[PDB]
Coordinates of C-alpha atoms and ligand atoms in Angstrom, one line a residue:
Chain K
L37 CA 45.3 -28.9 42.2
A38 CA 47.1 -31.1 39.4
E39 CA 48.8 -28.7 36.6
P40 CA 47.4 -28.6 33.0
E41 CA 48.8 -30.9 30.3
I42 CA 49.4 -28.5 27.3
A43 CA 50.2 -30.3 24.2
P44 CA 53.5 -28.4 22.6
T45 CA 51.8 -27.3 19.4
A46 CA 48.6 -25.8 21.7
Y47 CA 48.3 -22.4 21.9
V48 CA 47.0 -20.8 25.1
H49 CA 46.5 -17.1 25.6
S50 CA 48.5 -15.6 28.5
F51 CA 45.0 -14.1 29.3
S52 CA 43.2 -17.7 30.0
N53 CA 42.5 -18.4 33.4
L54 CA 43.4 -21.9 32.8
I55 CA 43.6 -23.9 36.3
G56 CA 43.7 -27.7 36.9
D57 CA 43.9 -30.9 35.5
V58 CA 43.3 -29.8 32.0
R59 CA 44.4 -32.1 29.1
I60 CA 45.1 -30.5 25.8
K61 CA 45.8 -31.7 22.7
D62 CA 47.5 -30.8 19.8
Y63 CA 47.0 -27.4 17.8
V64 CA 44.6 -26.4 20.2
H65 CA 43.7 -22.9 20.1
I66 CA 42.7 -21.1 23.5
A67 CA 41.7 -17.4 22.9
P68 CA 41.9 -14.5 25.7
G69 CA 39.1 -13.7 27.8
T70 CA 38.5 -17.7 28.4
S71 CA 38.1 -19.4 31.7
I72 CA 38.8 -23.0 31.9
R73 CA 39.1 -24.5 35.3
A74 CA 39.0 -27.9 36.6
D75 CA 39.0 -26.6 40.3
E76 CA 35.7 -28.5 41.4
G77 CA 34.8 -31.1 38.6
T78 CA 38.1 -32.7 37.2
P79 CA 39.7 -33.9 34.8
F80 CA 39.0 -32.3 31.6
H81 CA 40.0 -32.9 28.2
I82 CA 40.4 -30.5 25.4
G83 CA 41.0 -32.5 21.9
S84 CA 43.3 -31.9 18.7
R85 CA 42.7 -28.7 16.6
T86 CA 39.9 -27.7 19.0
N87 CA 39.2 -23.7 19.4
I88 CA 38.0 -22.1 22.6
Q89 CA 37.2 -18.5 22.0
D90 CA 36.8 -15.4 23.9
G91 CA 33.9 -15.0 26.3
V92 CA 33.6 -18.8 27.1
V93 CA 33.7 -20.8 30.6
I94 CA 34.2 -24.1 30.8
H95 CA 33.8 -25.4 34.3
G96 CA 32.2 -28.8 36.3
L97 CA 30.5 -29.9 39.0
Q98 CA 32.3 -31.9 41.7
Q99 CA 30.0 -34.9 41.2
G100 CA 29.3 -36.3 37.8
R101 CA 31.6 -37.6 35.3
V102 CA 31.2 -38.7 31.7
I103 CA 33.4 -41.6 30.0
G104 CA 35.9 -40.1 27.7
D105 CA 37.2 -42.1 24.3
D106 CA 40.1 -43.2 26.7
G107 CA 37.5 -45.0 28.9
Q108 CA 38.8 -42.6 31.9
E109 CA 35.9 -40.2 33.8
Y110 CA 36.1 -36.6 32.8
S111 CA 33.9 -33.7 33.9
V112 CA 34.4 -32.0 30.4
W113 CA 35.6 -34.2 27.3
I114 CA 36.2 -32.0 24.6
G115 CA 36.7 -33.9 21.1
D116 CA 39.1 -33.0 18.3
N117 CA 37.8 -30.3 15.8
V118 CA 35.6 -29.1 17.7
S119 CA 34.7 -25.0 17.7
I120 CA 33.6 -23.6 21.2
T121 CA 32.9 -20.1 20.3
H122 CA 32.5 -16.8 22.0
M123 CA 30.2 -16.7 25.1
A124 CA 29.5 -20.5 25.0
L125 CA 29.2 -22.2 28.3
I126 CA 30.6 -25.7 28.8
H127 CA 29.7 -27.2 32.0
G128 CA 30.6 -30.3 33.4
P129 CA 29.1 -33.3 33.3
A130 CA 29.7 -32.9 29.8
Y131 CA 30.8 -34.4 26.5
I132 CA 30.9 -33.3 23.1
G133 CA 32.0 -35.4 20.2
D134 CA 34.4 -34.6 17.6
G135 CA 33.8 -32.1 14.8
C136 CA 30.9 -30.4 16.9
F137 CA 30.3 -26.9 16.1
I138 CA 28.9 -25.1 19.3
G139 CA 27.7 -21.5 18.5
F140 CA 27.4 -18.1 20.1
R141 CA 26.1 -17.7 23.7
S142 CA 25.0 -21.6 23.7
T143 CA 25.2 -23.9 27.1
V144 CA 26.1 -27.6 26.9
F145 CA 25.4 -28.7 30.9
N146 CA 24.8 -32.1 32.2
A147 CA 24.3 -33.4 28.6
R148 CA 26.0 -35.6 25.8
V149 CA 26.5 -34.1 22.6
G150 CA 27.6 -36.5 19.7
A151 CA 30.2 -36.3 17.2
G152 CA 29.1 -33.6 14.1
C153 CA 26.4 -32.1 15.7
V154 CA 26.1 -28.2 14.7
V155 CA 24.7 -26.5 17.5
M156 CA 23.6 -22.5 16.6
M157 CA 23.5 -19.3 18.6
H158 CA 21.7 -18.9 21.8
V159 CA 21.1 -22.7 22.3
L160 CA 20.7 -24.4 25.8
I161 CA 21.2 -28.1 26.0
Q162 CA 20.7 -29.6 29.3
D163 CA 20.1 -33.2 30.8
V164 CA 20.2 -34.8 27.4
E165 CA 22.1 -37.0 24.9
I166 CA 22.1 -35.5 21.4
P167 CA 22.9 -38.6 19.0
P168 CA 26.0 -37.4 16.5
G169 CA 25.2 -35.3 13.3
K170 CA 22.3 -33.6 14.6
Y171 CA 21.5 -29.7 13.8
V172 CA 20.1 -27.3 16.7
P173 CA 18.6 -24.0 15.3
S174 CA 19.0 -20.6 17.1
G175 CA 17.1 -20.2 20.1
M176 CA 16.0 -23.8 21.3
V177 CA 15.8 -24.7 24.6
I178 CA 16.3 -28.4 25.0
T179 CA 15.6 -29.9 28.5
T180 CA 13.9 -33.0 27.6
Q181 CA 15.0 -36.2 26.0
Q182 CA 11.7 -36.1 23.8
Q183 CA 13.0 -32.5 22.3
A184 CA 16.7 -34.0 21.6
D185 CA 15.4 -37.0 19.7
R186 CA 13.1 -34.8 17.3
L187 CA 16.3 -32.7 16.1
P188 CA 16.8 -32.7 12.6
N189 CA 20.1 -34.3 10.6
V190 CA 22.9 -31.8 9.6
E191 CA 22.6 -30.6 6.3
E192 CA 25.1 -29.6 3.8
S193 CA 23.9 -26.2 4.5
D194 CA 24.4 -26.3 8.3
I195 CA 28.0 -27.8 7.6
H196 CA 28.7 -24.8 5.1
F197 CA 27.5 -22.1 7.8
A198 CA 29.6 -23.9 10.6
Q199 CA 32.6 -23.9 8.1
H200 CA 31.8 -19.9 7.3
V201 CA 32.2 -19.0 11.0
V202 CA 35.0 -21.3 12.1
Chain Y
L37 CA 34.4 5.7 45.6
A38 CA 34.0 4.2 49.3
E39 CA 35.7 1.0 49.5
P40 CA 33.9 -2.5 49.9
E41 CA 33.5 -3.9 53.2
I42 CA 34.5 -7.5 53.1
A43 CA 33.7 -9.6 55.9
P44 CA 36.7 -11.7 57.5
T45 CA 35.5 -15.3 56.3
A46 CA 34.4 -14.0 53.1
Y47 CA 36.4 -15.2 49.7
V48 CA 36.9 -12.8 47.2
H49 CA 39.6 -14.2 44.4
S50 CA 42.3 -11.8 43.2
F51 CA 40.7 -11.9 39.7
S52 CA 37.3 -10.7 40.7
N53 CA 37.1 -7.3 39.6
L54 CA 35.4 -5.9 42.9
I55 CA 34.8 -2.1 43.2
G56 CA 33.0 0.6 45.5
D57 CA 30.3 0.2 48.1
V58 CA 29.9 -3.7 48.1
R59 CA 29.0 -4.8 51.4
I60 CA 29.9 -8.5 51.7
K61 CA 29.0 -10.6 54.8
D62 CA 30.5 -14.0 56.5
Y63 CA 31.5 -16.7 54.1
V64 CA 30.6 -15.7 50.8
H65 CA 32.6 -16.9 48.0
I66 CA 33.2 -14.8 45.2
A67 CA 35.0 -16.7 41.8
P68 CA 37.5 -15.3 39.5
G69 CA 36.1 -13.8 36.3
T70 CA 33.3 -11.9 38.3
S71 CA 32.8 -8.1 38.1
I72 CA 31.0 -6.6 40.8
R73 CA 31.2 -2.9 40.9
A74 CA 29.1 -0.1 42.4
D75 CA 30.6 2.8 40.5
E76 CA 26.8 3.9 39.1
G77 CA 24.2 2.4 41.2
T78 CA 25.4 2.1 44.9
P79 CA 25.6 0.4 47.7
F80 CA 25.2 -3.3 46.9
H81 CA 24.7 -6.2 49.5
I82 CA 25.6 -9.4 49.3
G83 CA 24.7 -12.2 52.1
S84 CA 25.9 -14.6 54.0
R85 CA 27.2 -17.8 52.3
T86 CA 26.7 -16.5 48.9
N87 CA 28.1 -18.1 46.1
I88 CA 29.1 -15.6 43.1
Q89 CA 30.3 -18.0 40.1
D90 CA 33.1 -17.2 37.2
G91 CA 31.3 -15.4 34.4
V92 CA 29.0 -13.1 36.6
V93 CA 28.4 -9.4 36.3
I94 CA 27.0 -7.7 39.0
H95 CA 26.1 -3.9 38.4
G96 CA 23.8 -1.1 38.8
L97 CA 21.9 1.9 37.1
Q98 CA 22.8 5.2 38.9
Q99 CA 19.2 5.8 39.5
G100 CA 17.0 3.4 41.0
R101 CA 16.8 1.5 44.1
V102 CA 15.6 -1.5 46.5
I103 CA 14.9 -1.4 50.1
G104 CA 17.3 -3.7 51.8
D105 CA 16.6 -6.0 55.0
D106 CA 18.4 -3.3 57.0
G107 CA 16.0 -0.9 55.5
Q108 CA 18.6 1.1 53.6
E109 CA 18.5 1.7 50.0
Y110 CA 20.6 -0.9 47.8
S111 CA 21.1 -0.8 43.8
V112 CA 21.5 -4.2 44.5
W113 CA 20.7 -6.2 47.5
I114 CA 21.6 -10.1 47.1
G115 CA 20.6 -12.1 50.4
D116 CA 21.8 -15.0 52.3
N117 CA 22.7 -18.5 50.9
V118 CA 22.0 -17.3 47.3
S119 CA 23.6 -18.8 44.0
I120 CA 24.5 -16.5 41.7
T121 CA 25.5 -18.8 39.1
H122 CA 27.9 -18.6 35.5
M123 CA 27.1 -15.6 33.4
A124 CA 24.2 -14.3 35.3
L125 CA 23.6 -10.7 35.2
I126 CA 22.7 -8.8 38.6
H127 CA 21.6 -5.3 37.3
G128 CA 20.4 -2.8 39.5
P129 CA 17.6 -2.2 40.5
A130 CA 17.5 -5.4 41.9
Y131 CA 16.6 -7.6 45.1
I132 CA 17.2 -11.3 45.6
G133 CA 15.7 -12.9 48.5
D134 CA 17.6 -15.7 50.7
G135 CA 18.1 -18.6 49.6
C136 CA 17.4 -18.2 45.6
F137 CA 19.3 -20.3 42.8
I138 CA 19.7 -17.9 39.9
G139 CA 20.8 -20.2 37.5
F140 CA 23.5 -20.0 34.3
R141 CA 23.1 -17.2 32.3
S142 CA 20.1 -15.7 33.7
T143 CA 19.3 -11.6 34.3
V144 CA 17.6 -10.0 37.1
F145 CA 16.9 -6.5 36.1
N146 CA 14.7 -3.9 37.5
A147 CA 13.1 -7.0 39.6
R148 CA 12.7 -8.5 42.9
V149 CA 13.1 -11.9 43.6
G150 CA 11.5 -13.0 46.4
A151 CA 12.9 -15.4 48.9
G152 CA 13.3 -19.3 47.8
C153 CA 13.1 -18.8 44.5
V154 CA 14.1 -21.7 41.8
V155 CA 15.4 -19.5 38.8
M156 CA 16.8 -22.0 35.7
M157 CA 19.1 -21.0 32.9
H158 CA 18.6 -18.8 30.4
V159 CA 16.0 -16.5 32.1
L160 CA 15.1 -13.0 31.7
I161 CA 13.6 -11.6 34.8
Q162 CA 13.0 -7.9 34.3
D163 CA 10.3 -5.2 35.7
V164 CA 8.7 -7.2 37.8
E165 CA 8.0 -9.2 41.3
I166 CA 8.3 -12.4 41.7
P167 CA 7.0 -13.8 45.0
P168 CA 9.0 -15.8 47.4
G169 CA 9.3 -19.8 46.4
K170 CA 8.3 -19.4 42.6
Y171 CA 10.1 -21.6 40.4
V172 CA 11.0 -20.1 36.6
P173 CA 12.1 -22.7 33.6
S174 CA 14.6 -22.4 31.5
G175 CA 14.0 -20.5 28.5
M176 CA 11.3 -17.8 30.1
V177 CA 11.2 -14.3 29.1
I178 CA 9.5 -12.6 32.0
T179 CA 9.0 -9.0 31.7
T180 CA 5.4 -8.2 32.7
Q181 CA 3.9 -8.9 36.2
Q182 CA 1.1 -11.1 34.8
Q183 CA 3.6 -13.5 33.5
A184 CA 5.4 -13.5 36.9
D185 CA 2.2 -14.0 38.7
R186 CA 1.5 -17.2 36.5
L187 CA 4.7 -18.9 38.0
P188 CA 4.4 -21.9 40.0
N189 CA 5.4 -23.0 43.1
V190 CA 8.9 -24.3 43.7
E191 CA 8.3 -28.4 44.3
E192 CA 10.7 -30.7 45.7
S193 CA 12.2 -31.8 42.5
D194 CA 13.0 -28.2 41.8
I195 CA 14.8 -27.8 45.4
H196 CA 16.6 -30.9 44.6
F197 CA 18.0 -30.0 41.4
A198 CA 19.3 -26.4 42.4
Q199 CA 21.1 -28.5 45.8
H200 CA 22.8 -30.5 42.8
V201 CA 23.9 -27.9 40.8
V202 CA 25.2 -25.9 44.0
Chain X
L37 CA 48.7 -6.0 13.9
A38 CA 47.7 -2.2 13.3
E39 CA 47.4 -0.2 16.8
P40 CA 44.1 1.5 17.7
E41 CA 43.5 4.9 17.1
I42 CA 42.3 6.3 20.3
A43 CA 40.6 9.7 20.1
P44 CA 42.3 11.9 22.9
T45 CA 38.6 12.4 24.6
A46 CA 37.8 8.7 24.8
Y47 CA 38.1 6.5 27.8
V48 CA 39.3 3.0 27.7
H49 CA 39.3 1.2 31.0
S50 CA 43.1 -0.6 31.4
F51 CA 41.3 -4.1 31.9
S52 CA 39.9 -3.4 28.4
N53 CA 41.5 -5.9 26.1
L54 CA 41.6 -3.9 23.0
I55 CA 43.9 -5.0 20.1
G56 CA 44.3 -4.2 16.6
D57 CA 42.9 -1.5 14.3
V58 CA 40.1 -0.2 16.3
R59 CA 39.3 3.5 15.5
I60 CA 37.6 4.8 18.6
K61 CA 35.9 8.4 18.4
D62 CA 35.4 11.1 20.5
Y63 CA 33.8 11.0 23.7
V64 CA 33.6 6.6 23.9
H65 CA 33.5 5.4 27.2
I66 CA 35.0 1.5 27.2
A67 CA 34.0 -0.1 30.3
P68 CA 36.5 -2.4 32.3
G69 CA 35.7 -6.5 31.2
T70 CA 35.6 -5.7 27.8
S71 CA 37.2 -7.5 24.5
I72 CA 37.7 -5.6 21.7
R73 CA 40.0 -7.3 19.5
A74 CA 40.6 -6.9 15.7
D75 CA 42.8 -9.7 15.0
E76 CA 41.0 -11.4 12.8
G77 CA 38.3 -9.1 10.9
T78 CA 39.8 -5.8 10.9
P79 CA 39.4 -2.9 11.0
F80 CA 36.8 -1.8 13.7
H81 CA 35.2 1.5 14.0
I82 CA 33.0 3.0 17.3
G83 CA 31.8 6.5 16.8
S84 CA 31.5 9.2 19.3
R85 CA 29.7 9.1 22.5
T86 CA 29.3 5.3 22.2
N87 CA 29.6 2.9 25.5
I88 CA 30.8 -0.5 25.8
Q89 CA 29.8 -1.9 28.8
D90 CA 31.3 -4.6 31.0
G91 CA 30.8 -8.1 29.9
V92 CA 30.6 -7.1 26.1
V93 CA 32.8 -9.1 23.3
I94 CA 33.4 -7.3 20.1
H95 CA 35.5 -9.3 17.2
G96 CA 34.8 -10.2 14.1
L97 CA 35.5 -12.8 11.1
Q98 CA 38.5 -12.6 9.3
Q99 CA 36.2 -13.1 5.7
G100 CA 33.4 -10.3 5.6
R101 CA 32.8 -6.6 5.8
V102 CA 30.3 -4.0 5.8
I103 CA 30.7 -0.3 4.3
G104 CA 31.5 2.4 6.7
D105 CA 30.1 5.6 6.6
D106 CA 33.5 6.8 5.2
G107 CA 33.1 4.2 2.4
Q108 CA 35.7 2.2 3.9
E109 CA 35.5 -1.7 5.0
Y110 CA 34.8 -2.3 8.4
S111 CA 34.6 -5.9 10.0
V112 CA 32.4 -3.9 12.8
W113 CA 31.2 -0.6 12.3
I114 CA 29.4 0.8 15.3
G115 CA 28.2 4.5 14.7
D116 CA 27.8 7.3 17.0
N117 CA 25.7 7.5 20.4
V118 CA 25.3 4.2 20.4
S119 CA 24.7 1.8 23.9
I120 CA 26.2 -1.7 23.3
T121 CA 25.4 -2.6 27.0
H122 CA 26.1 -5.4 29.1
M123 CA 27.0 -8.6 28.0
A124 CA 26.6 -8.0 24.4
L125 CA 28.2 -9.6 21.6
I126 CA 28.8 -7.3 18.2
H127 CA 30.7 -10.1 15.7
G128 CA 31.7 -9.0 12.5
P129 CA 30.6 -8.6 10.0
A130 CA 28.2 -6.0 11.5
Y131 CA 27.2 -2.3 11.5
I132 CA 25.2 -0.8 14.0
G133 CA 23.9 2.8 13.2
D134 CA 23.8 5.8 15.0
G135 CA 21.8 6.1 18.0
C136 CA 20.5 2.4 18.6
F137 CA 20.0 0.8 22.0
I138 CA 21.8 -3.0 22.2
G139 CA 20.3 -4.3 25.6
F140 CA 21.9 -6.9 27.6
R141 CA 23.1 -9.9 26.3
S142 CA 21.9 -9.3 23.1
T143 CA 23.9 -10.5 19.8
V144 CA 24.2 -8.8 16.3
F145 CA 26.5 -11.4 13.8
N146 CA 26.5 -10.8 10.1
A147 CA 23.8 -8.0 10.2
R148 CA 22.8 -4.2 9.7
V149 CA 21.1 -2.6 12.4
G150 CA 19.8 0.7 10.9
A151 CA 20.3 4.0 13.0
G152 CA 18.0 4.8 15.9
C153 CA 17.1 0.9 16.6
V154 CA 15.6 0.0 20.2
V155 CA 17.0 -3.8 20.4
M156 CA 15.9 -5.2 24.1
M157 CA 17.4 -7.9 26.1
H158 CA 18.6 -11.4 25.3
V159 CA 17.6 -10.3 21.6
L160 CA 19.6 -12.6 18.5
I161 CA 20.0 -10.5 15.4
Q162 CA 22.0 -12.6 12.8
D163 CA 21.8 -12.8 8.8
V164 CA 19.6 -9.9 8.4
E165 CA 19.2 -5.9 7.7
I166 CA 17.1 -4.1 10.1
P167 CA 15.7 -0.8 8.7
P168 CA 16.0 2.4 10.8
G169 CA 14.1 2.9 14.1
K170 CA 12.7 -0.6 14.7
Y171 CA 12.4 -2.1 18.1
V172 CA 13.4 -5.7 18.7
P173 CA 11.4 -6.9 22.2
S174 CA 13.5 -9.3 24.7
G175 CA 13.9 -12.8 24.0
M176 CA 13.4 -12.5 20.1
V177 CA 15.6 -14.5 18.0
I178 CA 15.7 -12.6 14.5
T179 CA 17.3 -15.0 12.0
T180 CA 15.5 -14.4 8.9
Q181 CA 14.7 -11.2 6.9
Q182 CA 10.7 -11.8 6.9
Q183 CA 11.2 -11.7 10.9
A184 CA 13.2 -8.4 10.4
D185 CA 10.6 -7.0 7.9
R186 CA 7.8 -7.8 10.5
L187 CA 9.1 -5.5 13.3
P188 CA 7.6 -2.7 14.9
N189 CA 8.6 1.1 15.0
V190 CA 10.4 2.4 18.0
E191 CA 7.6 4.2 20.0
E192 CA 8.0 7.1 22.6
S193 CA 7.9 4.7 25.3
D194 CA 10.9 2.6 23.9
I195 CA 13.0 5.6 23.6
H196 CA 12.6 6.7 27.4
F197 CA 13.0 2.9 28.4
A198 CA 16.5 3.2 26.5
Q199 CA 17.3 6.4 28.1
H200 CA 16.2 5.5 31.4
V201 CA 19.1 2.5 31.0
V202 CA 21.7 4.7 29.6
Ligands
CL301 CL1 38.5 -15.5 19.9
CL302 CL1 26.0 -14.7 28.1
CL303 CL1 33.1 -20.7 39.6
CL304 CL1 29.6 -0.9 32.5
MG305 MG1 33.7 -12.2 30.6
ZN306 ZN1 30.5 -24.1 37.9
ZN307 ZN1 25.2 -1.2 33.7
ZN308 ZN1 35.3 -14.1 16.7

């Protein structure tokens, strides 16, 4: 496999299992107890200032890609200023836009989550595109585009909550 | 504890925490970031060509067994050609039949899942027997036999989905 | 960071990632595959005879504390005789009282769970106080005090179930 590209200012804990073509930008913080393996789906991108918390798994399917902001194909693209919090599962093909909060134990698989979404705890997002700036309440199981199209806009209280966690 | 029995063609990543009387058959693939410990409930069986993905925990209660296909008692029996996908929890007593798909973050505990079931994501299966060839939609919490008895049959689209993941 | 205080009779598996001011009392059993890190929120307390099972993450927010039974501030306080079972997430600020059962894949975050509660599987408890002696059925997503105030009392069958798991 190709080697990870780790920006000089990124922090990757030695207990993180990081393998393959994972392109990690400035000031990223990857906790211990994380798995980020581009051994099937590849490449991955993790944007600047993004935090990947303990218990997270990031993996991808061999087949299936999203378009990154650079126009290249990725198995997993996670933008800048994203929080991928404890126990989240980000499974390619997946795009998570800048500034998203992905709350505890939530999954994004075969999906696009637009910039500035606040996804709460114990959520499943699969097989859909969520436009920018939407809020997903805890426990929701979003598997159809019709559900995704009903989601409310992020309100100030949702941003404040996400800020208080991160 | 007894030692694992690892078939010559099985792959067990060095980062897997594999302990005790775990009987692993041909062409099994056990990922890093897995825990498969027969230190309480024992023995375990993992059938041929089965894949155990990163984030999975397989454990068992000291008391409580299922009958394996060899007539012996097991804490956990996982059949041939099974996919135990990311973050699944298989907790003995548990039987998972040949060809099952157990989707991301799903739990099987004190239960029997018949051959050829397709269990989707974020599912709980506990204290029930699911007959062969049933589909469990994402997010379902199955804790009673009445619920298990309502499950739909696997359709071609469900098999195709499972095939596309695996 | 400060070092953990590990009682002479406590068992902490060498594969546990235990860091910081974590105060672990008599006969605690911490499994492999656990993460218990007081590197942000601190301190933590884990009371006597408590079991922390494989797959658990215990972490805390830098800001936000609960009052422990000693009157001191903690990010996470887990009492005596508690079972924190596989894949549970206990995230500070959090108080879990003596004798609680926290079932598989359940989360307690920014919450107080009174002594003697039985919390089942795939539960979210967030932003609430649960009084002592309540039962939380599997799959419940408790995010408001109104929901917490509706919970049933633990019945003998719930205690028996918890006993059969632990
Ligand atoms: Cl973390
Ligand atoms: Cl999980
Ligand atoms: Cl894997
Ligand atoms: Cl354990
Ligand atoms: Mg883990
Ligand atoms: Zn995968
Ligand atoms: Zn166990
Ligand atoms: Zn945290």
